[PDB]
């Protein structure tokens, strides 16, 4: 939130899930942050560079966390043919 002069009021602008856009609550102790290492040419991971994926607690509880992760992985190019939009 902002006031009239433009400085940013309200603290800790919260994160959102990468599958279904929803604010991750502070006490929502069911949401994990998936980190994927980046390979480059030689086939070795480069420490420090990660592909950050966030999944909310509700998606994990449903059991669609695996389905969502492959969709994001395939969309960003991590995986190739593990997902099918026209199921």
């Amino acid at each position: 939130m902002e006031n009239d002069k433009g400085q940013l009021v309200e603290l800790y602008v919260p994160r959102k899930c990468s599958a279904t856009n929803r604010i991750i609550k502070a006490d929502d102790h069911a949401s994990v942050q998936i980190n994927v290492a980046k390979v480059d040419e030689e086939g070795r991971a480069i420490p420090g560079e990660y592909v950050t994926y966030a999944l909310s607690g509700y998606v994990r509880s449903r059991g669609e966390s695996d389905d969502s992760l492959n969709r994001l992985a395939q969309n960003d190019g991590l995986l190739k043919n593990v997902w099918s939009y026209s199921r």
Binding site: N35, V36, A37, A45, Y50, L78, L79, K80, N81, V82
Partner: peptide, 12 residues
């Protein structure tokens, strides 16, 4: 592909 995806996650 799921196995190598897990390997990258572990290596992360």
């Amino acid at each position: 592909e799921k196995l190598v995806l897990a390997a990258r996650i572990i290596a992360a």
